[PDB]
Q: What sequence folds into this?
């Protein structure tokens, strides 16, 4: 393959496309013999050179990595998420879909097809692996063999056209809670709220509209509510006609937080929209209710964090204003006005990729993990935020822990592994990929989840480099068809 | 896996164990659209940590790499050679066989089993892929799927216990010509000469004895003869009982060249042994007859080239005396004495891994390629000879060509690809793996075989590193079950 000599395709961003199997990877330290299951994660990774001769990171085809940890060892299985895009392009021997979220640039032969790369999450639910991209229904795969099934539309019961890549699992029921924005077509203001039972059946789909179409990438869930931030990374058909990146950031629009009842009978008038000044947030650590209040914890930045989705008024990207810090947004359902009850920064540590012990989804919670950018640390190699620490916040005491991966490495999203179903919150392990940039390889690190400063208790070496990852998740073996 | 922190297992020698598939590898330049077939090569690569807690490079399990070149692209498929050793150890989850060529160190559970790692050659003949190790019968594999068949003993017609990893194909018949030393058991002085027809049937097996047991790694073949150098890298049960490496070099023993008739009716008295002073040679570029003379071209060194098989009298390894240079050994079957007719250095370039256009096997020939060690070139990274150039010798004119891979890379064995069945000698391409040590990755280089100084016409990037390789070979698609 002839790929462009551009940053999105070179160095740490060289295409990989490795499908492989390696059991019993070389490792150091002690892999807890308690562990029996797998960590799935996804990297965008281009099957073919881009039609336009360049592209962005978020547009690579999804390649799924599974780390099966059992018997004190770690194995890897890596396979493509075989979306319809992947299949059509594979058969044609070339790219057929064009630029990111831009159907105007697709070959006529694939007009009308799902454009999903399934590249944003590798999530386990209902005995399946969900390879997810928020512009289409999710793809599903067999978590044991990593073969691909196809797109999930729930027996026809889903009529929205899209499905999130940030599903939540409500611990009170085991339901998957999901949204789909642009639900009636590209750039539309329609959103669906979906709930899926543990058996994988769609329980309900509820439609509503938002203040303006924007990237609704993530959201929170509580017992009673969908908690949906409206942040003006905006897109439009006009931008696409003009050849601009689908999304751009508008610093002049307000930010909203919508509180949407988790109810099949939802009507638009049931929704409350709280409004605040312009800012940026993408991911949700967790949300929860307290009395008549709703709290959501997000990495908040002053301005846009996506340089590739630039300021709509032509401002150059501002890295300083892109620094995000975990912040609690609180709104009171009993309040008279549409003002937030409070916005409270929870840490001065800058970071992203927030995670919790997912058994706490929607509940008051003590612990949060993030990838941290500590700009005070020495750096000799980079591979444009520098995510160089694992961070743990204790909301009960305020205490913070940090682990630095050293001056030639960076880190990918952590994921929490519970010791047992009814172990206390945070009792378990963190796993995360470490980019060993000087060695052009990756490690999988295993930490004691509440004692990270001493470093990983085990380091699994991969004999190749992973690419930049998006989201990932642990599942125990019994949830994924792997051996007891 | 917990591997030793020793040189044989770290850095460029880290275990890899990658089984993978990647079509359409990222590449630069122009892969000749004429090419349709595959280059197979083998790397020793340990499935498990060694029983003794250390080991040598030559003892890793064979991992087979196939580069399928077609339609102007290159694909990779990498699979284990599943020897009985591999299978038994895989089932046990641990090493069961011990040190190199040392059955005394094996677990009792595998006494009597073939110890082959099938790690020295990946050769195509009779519709099969031969994964070869000279201490056992060859393993065979399906060249298309790279599944393993098992050990080849030719329907019981082979009674020798071993088979070479340096088979030759006689162009006059298409027969495979092979030896097996230590043919009646470890360290024995019995050798078999085998010839196998193009259909894979054993034609004959002829037994003989040699002046002393030694590493009979390679040999030459001409129309009438097996040409067998006897070089005193010697082994014995006594060395193994004392815990020494199987082989050690004895500078006090003579070197012989045996001329053995290629005849099923061979008797010991039919063999002529020519004798010369101590020196070292391992590989054969080619051998051929001229009148009553036999010529064989070998990289000759003053002394041992294997630091891991040390001087039997305790001398430290001498790198200067280990420098090998292509040299013609000529013996006259009509001569009165046992002296060689001549020993003539053919180049001052130091090198190893000699190759020809294999259509010239046993015939007078014009071209030879080698890996060259040019100690005058700058080096910033190494990964203990530094093989940093591809070398081409023209025996007709004397002309030499060199291509240097640069200061942070090294090279693996080249292989010649003919343009067509009746293309002239040397009309075609050279392929070879390049270790890009600074990038911790490998390239496959494609050269115009007689115009190497301009550099490769195509460079295929692998998104991971291969390990040190041994021998490899090209076959056209029709010889290996791949698409026309
Ligand atoms: Co996300
Ligand atoms: Co050899």
A:
């Amino acid at each position: 393959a002839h790929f462009p000599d551009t940053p999105a395709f070179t160095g740490f961003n060289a295409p990989s496309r490795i499908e492989c199997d390696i059991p019993n990877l070389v490792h150091e330290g002690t892999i807890p013999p308690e562990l029996n299951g797998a960590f799935f994660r996804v990297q965008p990774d281009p099957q073919f050179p881009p039609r336009l001769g360049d592209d962005i990171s978020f547009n690579g085809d999804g390649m799924i990595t599974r780390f099966h940890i059992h018997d004190g060892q770690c194995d890897i299985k890596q396979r493509w998420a075989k979306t319809n895009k992947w299949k059509l392009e594979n058969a044609a021997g070339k790219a057929l879909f064009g630029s990111y979220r831009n159907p105007l640039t697709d070959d006529e032969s694939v007009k009308g097809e799902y454009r999903s790369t399934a590249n944003t999450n590798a999530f386990v639910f209902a005995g399946k692996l969900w390879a997810m991209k928020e512009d289409s229904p999710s793809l599903t795969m067999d978590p044991a063999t990593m073969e691909t099934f196809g797109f999930e539309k729930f027996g026809g019961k889903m009529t929205g056209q899209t499905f999130t890549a940030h599903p939540k699992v409500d611990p009170l029921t085991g339901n998957m809670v999901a949204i789909g924005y642009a639900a009636s077509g590209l750039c539309t203001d329609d959103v669906c709220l979906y709930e899926i039972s543990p058996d994988g059946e769609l329980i309900y789909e509820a439609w509503f509209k938002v203040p303006y179409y924007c990237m609704m990438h993530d959201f929170g869930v509580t017992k009673d509510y969908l908690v949906l931030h409206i942040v003006p990374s905006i897109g439009s058909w006009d931008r696409l006609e003009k050849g601009l990146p689908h999304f751009g950031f508008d610093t002049t629009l307000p930010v909203y937080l919508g509180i949407i009842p988790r109810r099949a009978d939802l009507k638009q008038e049931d929704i409350r929209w709280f409004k605040r000044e312009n800012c940026f947030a993408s991911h949700v650590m967790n949300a929860f209710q307290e009395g008549t209040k709703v709290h959501v914890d997000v990495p908040e930045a002053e301005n846009n964090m996506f340089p590739f989705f630039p300021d709509v008024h032509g401002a150059p990207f501002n890295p300083q204003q892109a620094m995000s810090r975990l912040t609690r947004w609180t709104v009171d359902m009993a309040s008279n006005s549409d003002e937030f009850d409070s916005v409270t920064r929870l840490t001065e540590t800058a970071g992203e990729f927030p995670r919790i012990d997912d058994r706490m989804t929607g509940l008051p919670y003590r612990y949060g993990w993030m990838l941290e950018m500590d700009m005070k640390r020495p750096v000799e190699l980079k591979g444009g935020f520098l995510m160089n620490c694992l961070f743990l916040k204790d909301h009960q005491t305020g205490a913070e822990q940090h682990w630095w991966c050293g001056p030639t490495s960076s880190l990918q999203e952590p994921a929490f592994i519970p010791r047992s179903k009814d172990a206390p919150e945070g009792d378990g392990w963190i796993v995360q990929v470490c980019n060993r940039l000087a060695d052009h390889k990756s490690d999988l690190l295993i930490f004691e989840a509440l004692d990270i400063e001493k470093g990983p208790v085990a380091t699994v070496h991969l004999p190749f480099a992973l690419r930049f990852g998006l989201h990932g998740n642990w599942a125990n073996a019994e949830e994924i068809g792997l051996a007891a």
Observations:
- The radius of gyration of chain A is 21 Å.
- The interface with chain B takes residues 1-3, 14-22, 24-28, 48, 73, 439-441, 461, 463-465 of chain A (CB under 8 Å).
- Residues 84-92 of chain A form the longest helix (9 residues).
